[PDB]
Design a protein around this nucleic acid. Structure first.
Ligand SMILES: Cc1cn([C@H]2CC[C@@H](COP(=O)(O)OP(=O)(O)OP(=O)(O)O)O2)c(=O)[nH]c1=O
Ligand SMILES: [Mg+2]
Ligand code: NA
Ligand code: NA
Length: 306
DNA sequence: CAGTAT
DNA sequence: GGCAATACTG
């Protein structure tokens, strides 16, 4: 009933969380369409509403049929459409083990021992199925330090191209120097088993940022929001890049006056906090560290599904 | 920006 | 008025 939040999932993020008011009391054409269409990667409430309003599309299947004829679709949208059916299949844990092994092996080959790959997401939380593959790529603790952001070396792009040349990565939804989102497909195993294409995210992370990145990219999402609210309540900013002690709420505002000023982020470029934000860093070497500073009991990854 | 993604 | 926080793109 109050599961009519799938409805509010048309953007009302805070109204959604709320159902998850009395009530004691206890749809629409384009709304159900929008509900359907926002299943497709690249289509949020507004893009979906636009498909309904300007294209007369009620259904994903109609969108698949009509996609090539609609010039206004982004490349990201066309990939989401092409792979829609594969994207809706859950990945069994045993297959994620193979993605992990594969990614680790190819990382060693093209990048060498200075680099490391870790799979996070619902997989690290030991769910029997996952929606996608969330990888973190980072330099090891023993790798010699760089004089620039690792993202500036173009290494994510190089890794992506290597994987493409192997026909593992076969379609790109979006790619910058920090984050790659696309479709990856394991090579056939020989009866020959052909694999479906899976959603693969790769995040390039600085070595000192790995513990907080592992927290973030392991999630779950609700878990992240909870831990971040605990941080706020103690005068900290927690993100994938670090734990930053900002102080009182007005000291935080002051800081953001210099460093944030954006609808972008608190003050990082290429995954490296600006110097004034970096001065706020509380160094951590483990997930446990973060829990400790925030006064929360450690939770194993499989217990981060609140 | 103002949409899309995580 | 604000709510977790950040990345990529037309
Ligand atoms: C969407 C979102 C996600 N995160 C974190 C939390 C997890 C990782 C991966 O996200 P995912 O949607 O794959 O979720 P995941 O837990 O891996 O589940 P599935 O892949 O769907 O199995 O990113 C976040 O901090 N804020 C967000 O708005
Ligand atoms: Mg995931
Ligand atoms: Na969507
Ligand atoms: Na691009």
């Amino acid at each position: 009933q109050e599961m009519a939040d799938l409805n509010n999932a048309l953007g009302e993020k805070y109204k959604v969380s709320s159902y998850h008011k009395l009530l004691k009391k206890a749809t629409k054409p384009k709304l159900k369409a929008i509900q359907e269409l926002t299943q497709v990667h690249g289509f949020g409430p507004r893009a979906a509403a636009a498909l309904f309003d300007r294209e007369g599309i009620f259904t994903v299947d109609e969108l698949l049929q009509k996609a090539d004829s609609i010039p206004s679709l982004t490349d990201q949208q066309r990939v989401g459409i092409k792979y829609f059916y594969d994207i809706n299949e859950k990945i069994p844990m045993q297959e994620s083990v193979l993605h992990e092994n594969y990614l680790r092996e190819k990382c060693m080959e093209v990048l060498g021992k200075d680099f490391s790959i870790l799979i996070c997401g619902s997989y690290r939380r030991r769910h029997p199925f996952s929606g996608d593959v969330d990888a973190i790529l980072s330099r090891t603790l023993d790798a010699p330090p760089l004089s620039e952001p690792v993202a500036a070396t173009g290494v994510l792009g190089h890794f992506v191209e290597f994987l493409e040349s192997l026909k593992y990565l076969e379609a790109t939804m979006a790619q910058g120097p920090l984050k790659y989102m696309g479709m990856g497909r394991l090579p056939p195993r020989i009866n020959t088993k052909v694999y479906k294409a899976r959603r693969v995210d790769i995040r390039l992370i600085e070595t000192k940022s790995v513990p907080t990145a592992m927290l973030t990219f392991t999630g779950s999402k609700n878990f992240n929001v909870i831990m971040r609210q605990a941080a706020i309540s103690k005068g900290y900013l927690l993100n994938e890049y670090g734990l930053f002690k900002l102080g009182t709420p007005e000291e935080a505002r002051a800081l953001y006056e210099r460093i944030g000023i954006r609808g972008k982020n608190a003050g990082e470029e290429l995954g490296v906090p600006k110097d004034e934000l970096e001065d706020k860093r509380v160094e951590v070497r483990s997930e446990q560290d973060v829990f400790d500073v925030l006064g929360m009991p450690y939770a194993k990854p499989e217990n981060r599904d609140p």
